[PDB]
Every structure is written in C-alpha cells, then in structure tokens.
Amino acid sequence: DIVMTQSPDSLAVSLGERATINCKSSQSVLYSSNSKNYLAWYQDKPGQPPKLLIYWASTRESGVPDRFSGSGSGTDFTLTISSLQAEDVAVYYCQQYYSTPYSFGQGTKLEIK
Ligand code: IUM
Ligand SMILES: [Zn+2]
C-alpha cells in the first residue's frame, strides 16, 4: 500500500510567520504519462468536515488564498503557509490517490504559538 508519512506531528508557529509541513510517500506518486503528482492536501478544523486545499500537489482549490502553497514531485511534498493566520489552526493531511487504496498521512496539528 502506498503509505503517507507527515512531519512534524505538531507545529506551533507564531502569527504572521511561515509554517512548513512535510509529507513523504513510500513510492513515487508522479504519473509519467500525465506528469501529474496524485497528491492532495486537506485542512481539517475541529468538529468540521475536512476541506480540500490543494490537489495535483500544487493546484489550489477555488477560494484558497495563495499564502497556502503545495510543492514537490515524486515522493517528497510540502505544504507551506506563508504568514499563518488565526483561522489556519487545524490539522493538515496529505493524501495520495495514485492507486487504490487511497491513503492519508497521520496529520500535522498546526497551532498558534
Ligand atoms: O474535524 U474533522 O474530519
Ligand atoms: Zn499573491
């Protein structure tokens, strides 16, 4: 199974500062025919359903501000929030949908320092 591993498990960043979250896939999720990374990022707020933030590893979902940026190819991916705002507090998850069963990381709890 393709296993997704996030780092760190928890991060306390100060408002206005940058938060960086890593996600590693056990095998490449970069499809050579497409040249696309089947990697997604979700933002999950307490008690709320998860919201899709970025897909194809770097494409932002409609409405998502550009301070959220996803990058990486193959096996190493990153979610960088430039200038963390109070509403950014949530657990962030990466997911691969390269091949079934689709899998997620254990999440990274992002908090205001
Ligand atoms: O808080 U919720 O998937
Ligand atoms: Zn901009």
CA atoms of 24 and 47, how far apart (whole Å): 27
The answer to whether 24 and 14 are in contact (CB under 8 A) is no
92: CA distance to ligand 1 center in Å? 10
Is any ligand 1 atom within 6 A of the Cβ of residue 32? no
Total number of domains constituting the chain = 1
35: CA distance to ligand 1 center in Å? 31
Is any ligand 1 atom within 6 A of the Cβ of residue 48? yes
State the residue range of the domain holding 96: 1-113
Resolution in A: 1.6
- How many alpha carbons fall within 13 Å on the CB side of residue 41? 29
CA atoms of 33 and 28, how far apart (whole Å): 13
What's at 28, amino acid-wise? S
The answer to whether 24 and 57 are in contact (CB under 8 A) is no
**CATH number for the domain harbouring residue 16:** 2.60.40.10
Instruction: Give the method of determination.
Output: X-ray
Tokens of 30: 């970069």
Q: Which ligand is nearest to the CA of 48?
A: 1
Alpha carbon of 10 to those of 41, 52, 81, 101: distances in Å? 16, 20, 14, 26
The rounded Cα 109 to chain-centroid distance in angstroms is: 12
Tokens of 9: 């498990």
What's at 82, amino acid-wise? S
- How many CB atoms are located within 10 Å of the residue 24 CB? 15
Residue position matching structure tokens 């498990």: 9
The DSSP code sequence of 27-96 is S--EETTTTEE-EEEEEE-TTSPPEEEEETTTEEPTT--TTEEEEEETTEEEEEESS--GGG-EEEEEEE
Report the atom number in ligand 1 closest to the C-alpha of 90.
Answer: 1
Calculate the dihedral angle through the C-alpha atoms of 105, 66, 35, 21, rounding to the nearest 10 degrees. Answer: -30
Backbone phi, then psi, for 19, in 5-degree steps? -115, 135
The answer to whether 97 and 40 are in contact (CB under 8 A) is yes
